[PDB]
Amino acid sequence: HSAFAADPGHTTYIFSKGGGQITYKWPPNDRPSTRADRLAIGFSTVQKEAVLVRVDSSSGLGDYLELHIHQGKIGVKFNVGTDDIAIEESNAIINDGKYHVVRFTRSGGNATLQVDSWPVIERYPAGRQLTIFNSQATIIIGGKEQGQPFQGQLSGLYYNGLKVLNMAAENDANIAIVGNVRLVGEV
Amino acid sequence: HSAFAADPGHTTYIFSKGGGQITYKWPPNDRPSTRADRLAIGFSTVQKEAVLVRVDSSSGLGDYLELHIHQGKIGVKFNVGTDDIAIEESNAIINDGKYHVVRFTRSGGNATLQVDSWPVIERYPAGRQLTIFNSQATIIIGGKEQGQPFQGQLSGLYYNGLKVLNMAAENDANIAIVGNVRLVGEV
Amino acid sequence: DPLVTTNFGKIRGIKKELNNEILGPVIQFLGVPYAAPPTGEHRFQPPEPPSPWSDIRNATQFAPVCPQNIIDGRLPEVMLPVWFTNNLDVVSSYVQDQSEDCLYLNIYVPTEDGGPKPVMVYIHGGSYMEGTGNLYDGSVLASYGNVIVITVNYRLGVLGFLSTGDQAAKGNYGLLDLIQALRWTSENIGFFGGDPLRITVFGSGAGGSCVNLLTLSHYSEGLFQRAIAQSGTALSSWAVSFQPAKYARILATKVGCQVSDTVELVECLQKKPYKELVDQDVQPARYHIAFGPVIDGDVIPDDPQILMEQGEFLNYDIMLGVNQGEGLKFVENIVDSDDGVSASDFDFAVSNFVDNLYGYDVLRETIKFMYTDWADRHNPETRRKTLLALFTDHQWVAPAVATADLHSNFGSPTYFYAFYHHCQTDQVPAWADAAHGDEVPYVLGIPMIGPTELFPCNFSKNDVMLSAVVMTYWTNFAKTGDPNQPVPQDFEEVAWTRYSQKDQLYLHIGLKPRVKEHYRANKVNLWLELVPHLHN
Amino acid sequence: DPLVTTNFGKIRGIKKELNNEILGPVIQFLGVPYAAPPTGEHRFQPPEPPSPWSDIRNATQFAPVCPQNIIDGRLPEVMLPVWFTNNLDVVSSYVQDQSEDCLYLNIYVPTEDGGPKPVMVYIHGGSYMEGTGNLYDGSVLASYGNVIVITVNYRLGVLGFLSTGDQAAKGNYGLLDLIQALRWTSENIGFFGGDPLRITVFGSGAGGSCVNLLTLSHYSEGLFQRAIAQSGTALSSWAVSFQPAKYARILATKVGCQVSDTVELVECLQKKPYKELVDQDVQPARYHIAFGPVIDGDVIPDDPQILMEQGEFLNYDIMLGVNQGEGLKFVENIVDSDDGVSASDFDFAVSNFVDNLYGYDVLRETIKFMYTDWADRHNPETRRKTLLALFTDHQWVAPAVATADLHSNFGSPTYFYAFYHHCQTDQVPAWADAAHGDEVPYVLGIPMIGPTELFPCNFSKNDVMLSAVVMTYWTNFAKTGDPNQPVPQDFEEVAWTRYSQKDQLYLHIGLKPRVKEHYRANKVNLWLELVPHLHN
Ligand SMILES: *[C@@H]1O[C@H](CO)[C@@H](O[C@@H]2O[C@H](CO)[C@@H](O)[C@H](O)[C@H]2NC(C)=O)[C@H](O)[C@H]1NC(C)=O
Ligand SMILES: *[C@@H]1O[C@H](CO)[C@@H](O[C@@H]2O[C@H](CO)[C@@H](O)[C@H](O)[C@H]2NC(C)=O)[C@H](O)[C@H]1NC(C)=O
Ligand SMILES: *[C@@H]1O[C@H](CO)[C@@H](O[C@@H]2O[C@H](CO)[C@@H](O)[C@H](O)[C@H]2NC(C)=O)[C@H](O)[C@H]1NC(C)=O
Ligand SMILES: *[C@@H]1O[C@H](CO)[C@@H](O)[C@H](O)[C@H]1NC(C)=O
Ligand SMILES: [Ca+2]
Ligand SMILES: [Ca+2]
């Protein structure tokens, strides 16, 4: 009973100094390919630069999805075959320390980014593009291996039906927590 | 001590009814190829149609030389690669029962036929032809296997230095006489 | 009496015990309607869900098959499985009863003495013109492997594949039928004890083609999870119809229609008695198909070669393979009681072949050169071998490899086999290797019973073992997407390694099973890498 | 004191005993002039007969060799025998003494303890630019086989082959020198006990080329009766010069001539000191020759390919063959201490090769495809093998086959061998098969003596046996035109069968000598039948 439109949070992981990383990994025999992707992540931070999540394809494939902060503006950058595609919320800033929910959406070449209730950014292509994200290997929450570890909090991370962080707080066999990451509970 | 230029006669062979055949055969390891050929044959006949001599190439090769009588006129037909070439003495007739010496000469594409002292027939080509008669296998005097056996006398047959009939009268290892052929001697 | 309740009503099966006292009997539900009859106004339209019934429905006999004509028709002997061509008398009997209302599937459910079982759905196909799922008894496979086996009937030939390249008739009806069948299965197989998240689709020949085609389609998203294509791909010359409009027109003409507007064309055919449509003879190019799957920008969004090349397909577990002497029928009639082929007929064969497949001399020369044994090029037995190999390599081996290369390249678990054993009949020359369709009885576990009317071969003792090996591999794949996991082979170091472009490991399947690399690497690369460089 | 009287005067030889006490010594006549000095007015002219002398002439020392430059020259290492390139310090010593007056031959006469012996005339040749007959000691061959062996010196390079494609300089002087040498031999070797009706001409490398070219010439009519060409044909890219005028011009230019009229061009060169001509560096296209035999419609009436194709050549007993790894030097320096070749260097090699030989990509792709082992295409050892084979197949194997095919087709007794053993030196990589020029020491019976300065290999026991086998075949051929007749091999069923286009039987010459059929027929036919169809 999850919904992409419903708030993705409330499994509140703190990513403090020294960096942290939570990683979900699909079994090599069941890495999904998708024509459409829906990411929703609830977070809070003050950082100027960080990489929150990145979905990477198997080896020898260039398909990936990267959600990151750059100059306090949240944005996405992905590749499904052709070339890198970029979309970013520049109208404003999100590193003000309060809770936000950034949604990203992909339909083949089509893409979507919204920060809360702000104006949905739309990125349409002037020509048909490839439509499939081939065999997804890992979800890498943290951005440590990218040399821009994220610092702050994440209450939830929904990815194509998956409640990634909730699954981590359930010690799910696929989740691997590594680094400065605490599962701040309640009360 | 033999010459093309000499009368080739005087080893006289009688080719009587029922047909006859004298055959010279070169060893498979020494079949000659020649850029020029010199044939001289002394004969007498009354026949309207016969094949006197035929030189044939090895197997799988179409090179040959045929001396024959057709409609009482002596003629030659040969092939050295390109196509059949024909030359004949039509100015007159030679099957009147008396002794004649026909000479045939080949120089690549060039050819020559003379019947006694009559006008040398010349057969020049209006373009370069193949010049070589490739590995000569047998000389077949008689024309039996061609279904036109010769009937009359042959006093001598010169071929490229070879006195073929004389070699037959010397029981040469390579001569094979078969059929109605007698070596009428002297006195 | 065995009864199941489905979203449409209650159905009663029938029990069946096998001619083998080691296998527990099965309950089979025969003639289960998975869709409303595609008749009248629904002709040349996608299939609709079946109507429900307030009744106990008897599913104890096969329903009539989809209209076809296997006697006075053309019968593409090269496309068809050898076992089918060789006794169409026994085949005819399965198809004596036909109806346009023919959208039925058959379920084979095992018998215990805990947990939803895998479902193996079999898609048949000779040339898209003929056949039934009913020809394939899923009993032994279901009983031996403890999986549910379904065999499906979908629209065939004209009724299943007519297309104008327009919206008048969009085509692919038979493919949509298979989707619908898989829908019904996904949402109704639980009631039989099946597992909707572990459905494996499988087929041989044009059945394989269907399997592959379905994996390129965004319609089969979430309906099945693994696929086995046997001697069949989506990249062979007879996989899809590239000129459907042309043949719709010719068919329309042949039955007296106004071929003017395409709407008036379909409207005309919409109304004719199906027999008129079926009894018509529309001959396509030599190694091509007239009525078959079509690139419609929907079910099949584009040329399979392009889609596959670009990775525009989802992740599935894939198993595919080829037989040693698939192209028996290409050569059979050109042989000469001495079991050989003249250097004369060879040149013809190859020249004609390249003509039909490629057109309007360096290629013709190159192929003649490549398929000549320059050691004894006068051996007329060798000449038939390499001639047969040319057709097998072109129509089957190279497309399978290309398919395996492209699925594995894009992350899909891939397993590749080469089938190198068969049961020889008196119906086939003794010099013949595994022909087209010869894997089937093993997969269906026919040796476990011994000769049937359909497969009348005298299965040896080794045939039974092989079948058990094959069936274990297939059912292991169905269970886990790995032909090795659960049931093991009792094949020590003989583990079916996963295929990838690096070593291209494949399983040599025969009386001396082994795992080799780069199957027929020389010819495959000829056709896949070198032959393209000789085009314009 | 051995003396012989020739049509030109009396000559005194010298005795020579071999480093083997099984072989009877020989008398060798060294530096016998077979023609007048080709100097001054006779430069770029056919040779004239030698002047007579009223004197006892000393023929006990080699005369100076024909002018050449093997140090600071180019040195086409691909064309040259490996034994030659690997120690040109020892080679240089043979060539330290040069003169334009250099038309001398050397006679090796056996010693008895009845009947005119066969004469084997050896034509040397690396690239037509360098060498001497002096490098080849005919002693052992003459003593072991009881045949007279002559080794000849003919004009080389510019002096031997300058041509303007005109009557100014008509070319082929070095070939006419060989004709003249064979004239002298035919009318003077009886005095030494030689048989003018049993002369066998033989040669390796460009020597083989000369042998073959001579058999297409009507000048060699009645001068010799058999021929052995070893790793050498008239059909390879470097057998004849097809653009002589171009290079005469470049040469003229380089030494300061008025390249205007061709008559004033030759006049200019006529007069220059030969060193000026020799020290000049005129580089032709990669695998081609600048100064060599020329089609002059006289000595060489037309393109050897055409003549051979049309059977425009007389009957000879022919023996010819190739070595297993002729093309050593094509790959040697591209290898990488790991004894392998990168897939990178490969593409280059094959691309560059095809560019040079064929020009301005379907052929380039076909060749790369044909010479790739699609089983482990990553094996860098295999990559060097097939790369080596590519050059060997193209420059040697295919032409030799074509030549055997055509001679035999037109009735000439033909014997074909493939040489598959050698004596490995430290100068050659250990993975190397028999390279170009490696049959020579065997034929010269060098193992019978053991290492010499020239061939310093440590000949095993088997090397001596092989040599004796080879020498028996060669001299048997010289004696009868059949490598089998007289001296038998003591090779039971091992009889060198006559080569014909039917089975194309050839003698594998190794430690395990056998006769086989269709040597490398796949690759040969690739180059002979199929590559033609890829031209415009
Ligand atoms: C299903 O098939 C059965 C078997 O032929 C049919 O039922 C028969 O007809 C009636 C219905 O119960 C009974 O009087 C008979 O005893 C039944 N036969 C037996 C022994 O099974 C019927 O045609 C089908 N079921 C229905 C009623 O739709
Ligand atoms: C296939 O089965 C036949 C039987 O139909 C086998 O023949 C056996 O021997 C003779 C010859 O036909 C028959 O009279 C027997 O009845 C058969 N034995 C049985 C009961 O199987 C035949 O050997 C088999 N074909 C082969 C050789 O594969
Ligand atoms: C040939 O060379 C010989 C080798 O020396 C020369 O012979 C010397 O001179 C005469 C030859 O007639 C002999 O009587 C001497 O005994 C030789 N000298 C010695 C002791 O070696 C000779 O000059 C050359 N031949 C000729 C005569 O031209
Ligand atoms: C090979 O020859 C050398 C001399 O050049 C010799 O010293 C060496 O020992 C030989 N190798 C053997 C033992 O075969
Ligand atoms: Ca993609
Ligand atoms: Ca000829």
Side-chain angles (χ1 to χ4, degrees), chain D residues 251-273:
Chain D
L251 178 57
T253 273
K254 282 194 152 226
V255 290
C257 294
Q258 300 211 49
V259 69
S260 44
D261 328 308
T262 62
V263 291
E264 194 190 324
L265 185 146
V266 188
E267 272 189 10
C268 180
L269 297 167
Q270 265 282 1
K271 298 166 159 82
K272 302 207 94 80

Side-chain angles (χ1 to χ4, degrees), chain B residues 106-127:
Chain B
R106 183 188 73 76
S107 302
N110 307 344
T112 261
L113 199 66
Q114 178 168 43
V115 173
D116 271 314
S117 279
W118 315 358
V120 172
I121 306 293
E122 293 193 337
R123 175 79 209 264
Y124 293 92

Side-chain angles (χ1 to χ4, degrees), chain A residues 28-35 58-61 80 128-135, chain C residues 218 221 301-302 306-307 310-315 317 409-413 480-481 498:
Chain A
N29 58 316
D30 210 38
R31 300 175 192 180
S33 309
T34 40
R35 24 109 215 164
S58 291
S59 309
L61 295 187
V80 279
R128 102 196 217 173
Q129 302 285 349
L130 295 186
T131 76
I132 298 202
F133 192 160
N134 292 107
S135 93
Chain C
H218 273 75
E221 185 163 293
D302 203 347
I306 302 332
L307 293 183
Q310 299 179 313
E312 293 287 281
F313 54 84
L314 300 173
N315 68 323
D317 299 303
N409 175 59
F410 285 100
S412 302
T480 66
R498 179 213 298 220

Side-chain angles (χ1 to χ4, degrees), chain C residues 12 55-56 58:
Chain C
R12 167 185 311 145
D55 220 284
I56 28 152
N58 298 317

Side-chain angles (χ1 to χ4, degrees), chain C residues 144 462 464-474 476 483-484 487-497 507-515:
Chain C
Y144 176 98
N462 291 299
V464 184
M465 87 100 166
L466 230 208
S467 187
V469 174
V470 169
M471 289 198 289
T472 295
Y473 281 132
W474 268 230
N476 286 5
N484 290 307
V487 192
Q489 304 276 357
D490 54 357
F491 295 70
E492 316 161 3
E493 295 292 305
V494 199
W496 200 331
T497 326
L507 203 270
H508 170 106
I509 292 184
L511 261 37
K512 10 66 194 183
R514 299 182 172 266
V515 38

